Amino acid sequence: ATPHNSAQVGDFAETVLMCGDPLRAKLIAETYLENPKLVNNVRGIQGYTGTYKGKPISVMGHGMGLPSICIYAEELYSTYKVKTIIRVGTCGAIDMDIHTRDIVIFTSAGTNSKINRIRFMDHDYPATASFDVVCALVDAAKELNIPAKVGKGFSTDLFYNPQTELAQLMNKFHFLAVEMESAGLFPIADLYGARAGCICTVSDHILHHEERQNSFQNMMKIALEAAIKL
Amino acid sequence: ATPHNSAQVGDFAETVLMCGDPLRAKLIAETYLENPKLVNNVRGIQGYTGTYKGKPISVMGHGMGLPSICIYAEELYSTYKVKTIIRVGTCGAIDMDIHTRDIVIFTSAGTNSKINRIRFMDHDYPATASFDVVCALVDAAKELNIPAKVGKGFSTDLFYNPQTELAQLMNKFHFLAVEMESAGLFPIADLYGARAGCICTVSDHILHHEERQNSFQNMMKIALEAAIKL
Amino acid sequence: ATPHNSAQVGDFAETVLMCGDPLRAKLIAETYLENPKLVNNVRGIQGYTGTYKGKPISVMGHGMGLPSICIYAEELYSTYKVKTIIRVGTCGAIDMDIHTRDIVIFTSAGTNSKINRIRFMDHDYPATASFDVVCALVDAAKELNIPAKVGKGFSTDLFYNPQTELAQLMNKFHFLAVEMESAGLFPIADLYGARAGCICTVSDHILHHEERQNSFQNMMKIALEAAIKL
Amino acid sequence: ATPHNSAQVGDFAETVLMCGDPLRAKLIAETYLENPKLVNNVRGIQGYTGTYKGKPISVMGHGMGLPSICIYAEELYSTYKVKTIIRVGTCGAIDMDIHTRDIVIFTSAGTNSKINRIRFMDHDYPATASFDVVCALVDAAKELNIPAKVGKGFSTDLFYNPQTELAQLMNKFHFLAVEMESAGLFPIADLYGARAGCICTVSDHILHHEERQNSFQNMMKIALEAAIKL
Amino acid sequence: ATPHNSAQVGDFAETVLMCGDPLRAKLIAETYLENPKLVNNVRGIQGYTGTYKGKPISVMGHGMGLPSICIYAEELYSTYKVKTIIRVGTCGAIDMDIHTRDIVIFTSAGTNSKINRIRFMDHDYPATASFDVVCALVDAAKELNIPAKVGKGFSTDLFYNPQTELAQLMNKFHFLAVEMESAGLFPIADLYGARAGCICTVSDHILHHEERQNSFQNMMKIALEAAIKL
Amino acid sequence: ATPHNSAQVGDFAETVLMCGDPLRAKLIAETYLENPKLVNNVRGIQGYTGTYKGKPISVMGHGMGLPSICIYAEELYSTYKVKTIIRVGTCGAIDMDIHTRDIVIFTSAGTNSKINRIRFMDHDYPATASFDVVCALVDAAKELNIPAKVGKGFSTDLFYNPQTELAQLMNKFHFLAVEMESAGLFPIADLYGARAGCICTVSDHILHHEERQNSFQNMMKIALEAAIKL
């Protein structure tokens, strides 16, 4: 149906969970979904559709970086009529009070990318997670009573950032963690009147040197439950 | 104590409500606060401190524009040790589904100002309302059962915008309304590890032509109650 | 007549003196104008109209920052058919040869704001004081034989500037002082084929630590006389 | 050894061919390499190392977008001591004289990304293919007598570009085709004193509507032979 | 002494008149100066030094564009200890009320160049003519009773401007004329605590189609006399 | 025929060699061309047309800086129907492995100018030398067996660069040398479907302190021979 998706309208649930690693999406589909069916594997993206507690739910990879997720997200909302996209994955901690294995729920994401300025007449577009999704994720976390930090994330275009002072600058402003897609996902959802959100498990701290499964499983519980609530 | 505030540390409550119009802040202090005392009137800013349901609460004007509120907000957090600043006021509707008299709670604010790029190494800083404040405002609205729209706002540097296409662009991305301070307030709160939020009553629609007291009073109820919850 | 002005066309003189502090404008009106009449007090802006040496002259506040003065100035030229706006006020010295209490007449103003780039297709617009006004102010100063420095000013969006190196950079280029409106005022006057200028009394030096009435009164004499000459 | 590569120094040849699609890299390894061994499959990237005409050669996916390839390329040069990276893949034609199935060899690549400005103090960095690689690709094409167009490419951050006028602008300047990695690859090679180049087969035209295997196989012949020449 | 000047300190007068055309500078030296001596001809720049009414005065070409004049001006202030540089030449009219053959005295100059942003931490630097020079030029014009328009000029990097809407934009803001050096000259003078100014004779109108000697001679009279006054 | 060229269509050969110094172009015409005829001397630009090995060839100055060469190059392609422009001249070495007297052939040129962003919707345009010209220059060098380095150049707007860190940054990325026109020349050739290239002899090193005729003559041999090959 699209240059990056062989599936047809209806093959995807209205709620899709996405992570960068296609093998993680495969794992997620085999571990948490019932009767997972491979609906798209163009570029080995591992797009599946199954059910969770009886409700349709899809999981698919989105690659690394804003340009990548921008391709997948826009096609999902536009062609497959998806309504909600929840980004699930790992991230690097920025804030000194954020530790490895911590779970973070993004209220929004800053970025050093030019994509949003291109879409917003060179002005400041606040890549903001859909309030419904942020609420669904936080309520799920509260109901499951799983500690989670809510706040700003940063989507960098440079995993290996030349601007070494940026890290401390973000710490001063209390950005929670760094990843590479949220800032791109959020504005696309707005344009399509759809919804998006993001939750990550800190797998490393960029300001200093500091089991990882429990944290990842807890994050998945939150995303899945929130998905049902939505 | 500061170039724009004659008050001394302790004269202001840890929670301050702010609006652009100094006469509105005076009105608010005389109408909703008990035993309001003028604590600062440099530049006729009308800074008062009284109590609401027994709790200390201050109200003060902040002028129009990011540069103005940036002066007042930074001094309040830094010198007067204020913890929470809730911006209350009017705004212009952008989204076609947003109507005059509607109450809007900002999740974040975009801007055409250069201030955040100056503070954030020329990158995209998501001027995000503190999640605690957004929640306090929304819960108050739910408890008072007062319809309110939650979403993105836009803080313009140009009330009379030369870029006439921006209005429709923001409508496509579903920005709710336009004002002139939020985008400046939010990042300052982050820097001081403090909190900030914003709630406005739509007093006009910028995309077409379309009582105003009830809406303003309801907005004040929400802000005041949320202030107590915080 | 406008969202920020209750006065009607004709209530304002063709020449208006403006300062940030509304209480200063009130003081100016009661101290230097004959039969001052309050013509506008929306947002407590203190807009008056009286006479000086028999000629009509208005004085009104304009708040702090380019966005604020941009609102007031554009409405004055456009709706109230004002012809000349002379900004009078205080400023911070930059140049090491400029001292506190010195009077400065702006030839132009630089800025770290994005407003002029928005109006000028992202290019460099030289916020220049109207040559007639600069001349009127300088001749008045010469005739009153009051020492005054003529040169570049800087209109910052950030009173509390994070970029601490900017101060010395401006000293190297010999910017005289810093304020927060001139750079916004000047281009608006050009657009309306009207005139604008600015004169300030240095109330503090930003590069080091260093009666204030005489300087302020002398500055007012210059502005008033120049107003008559125009 | 790295967050995205499980292989160890020595597992990769000094010359690596890369394409966005991991399944294409798998296909390439099974079709053109002798004794291909999977050396890295983190995130299903399909990194292989085999031999072509007796010489060591690796093939691996790099995902879509500058941020993605920037991660893989920098790790290859820095950690695995790779010397040459030749990007092989598909692209969209821009120039009206460029047709679908045409083979294009990039001399350089323009971009709407902010990555190079971040690495180059906000100036214009010419993402240029290594002259040795451009020559090796062109000589191979000449020796194999396979028609190929040499010229500028464009690496977009937005596959679905909102700026619809850009396409015709690039046509006027004669950009040959569009892809999403070259502009990111080239500067990284320069920084590591290494080499990089790109060759693509046009799979579609963005300015109008206009077998695909022959073109892809011919492109692979050129890349492989050039790899040997280097 | 410098890469572009063979003269030695002292060969140039403290006041130098400059124009783009080296042949015009030669003409000026032979027509208005007494005992003109060629002091520099590197790159055929035609740098002369003679006397006018007994006072030392130099005339030299400066090429076309900000980068060119920036080279010559900085060397003159820095190495040859020049104090005043008055740019004399031709320009294109912008304002509809400005006609061919009109003489224009620049108060300042806007630009689409990046040079000033590079020198001014990416902010808006107002390329302003030295007030002493502007005054000297205007007084000379008044004393010689030669009609001259005083106002903003624009220094473009593109004589053949692709942005065809800029012309009308500048007309709306009342820029008087266009040339290619002033915006570069002015900031350099500031840095060296020296002085600079510009006066031009409109040789063509860019907004419509509309003897040239008288205008040029009158402009030279103004510059020369002003030079003496300084 | 044009504001900067008195010659008429046909007076210039389809291949023009250009250098900044007009006296160097005169020297080149008298030293390497047979029967050189002055075809244009507006602004003393020294435009000649003669023959080399029986083929028509023109040589003309282009001044210093992108704005200057942009004027001359665009008029040559557009009005005089020139097909190839080869920039010949001197440059400053950047790379530590590049030494004075070395000959450099530009593959492309980076720049700190805003011209290309203005022509390319504020994106990154890779100022790339025409591949035919780069090849002609390199083959000539190989056939004449004259050592020459091929790589990136940088066209600065500031000969006296305030950003002193840029030099080392470019060294890290291996820019070969610095000049002031290439980045402007290349994009203009693309727009006119014509060709351009550049070759320079390093006359100085900007990173340290380190006969000059042989190098200049060898560079001229390469340019001339390449001109014939084209």
Ligand SMILES: Nc1nc(F)nc2c1ncn2[C@@H]1O[C@H](CO)[C@@H](O)[C@H]1O
């Ligand atoms: N520390 C980290 N820094 C950045 F920039 N991204 C991180 C980090 N940890 C995980 N990620 C996620 O995995 C990919 C990058 O390895 C990207 O897809 C990103 O979302």
Ligand SMILES: Nc1nc(F)nc2c1ncn2[C@@H]1O[C@H](CO)[C@@H](O)[C@H]1O
């Ligand atoms: N329609 C509107 N557009 C903009 F830009 N700001 C609005 C609007 N309505 C109210 N405001 C609030 O009042 C002031 C501007 O009049 C500013 O202080 C701002 O916060």
Ligand SMILES: Nc1nc(F)nc2c1ncn2[C@@H]1O[C@H](CO)[C@@H](O)[C@H]1O
């Ligand atoms: N030192 C100073 N720095 C800056 F940025 N602005 C100054 C200063 N002194 C006075 N002002 C004027 O008063 C207000 C800021 O307090 C603004 O309205 C401004 O015009």
Ligand SMILES: Nc1nc(F)nc2c1ncn2[C@@H]1O[C@H](CO)[C@@H](O)[C@H]1O
């Ligand atoms: N027409 C096209 N436009 C763009 F922008 N990229 C193209 C096109 N065809 C193929 N590609 C390559 O495949 C991916 C995008 O589908 C990216 O990885 C890119 O390199």
Ligand SMILES: Nc1nc(F)nc2c1ncn2[C@@H]1O[C@H](CO)[C@@H](O)[C@H]1O
């Ligand atoms: N109409 C005009 N437009 C521009 F952009 N520059 C003009 C014009 N007329 C004369 N000049 C002066 O001469 C040179 C450009 O031909 C430049 O050196 C410039 O100063």
Ligand SMILES: Nc1nc(F)nc2c1ncn2[C@@H]1O[C@H](CO)[C@@H](O)[C@H]1O
């Ligand atoms: N070291 C150098 N740095 C820069 F920026 N340009 C150089 C250098 N050497 C020679 N040039 C060439 O000569 C003129 C500048 O003197 C310009 O025309 C330029 O092309």
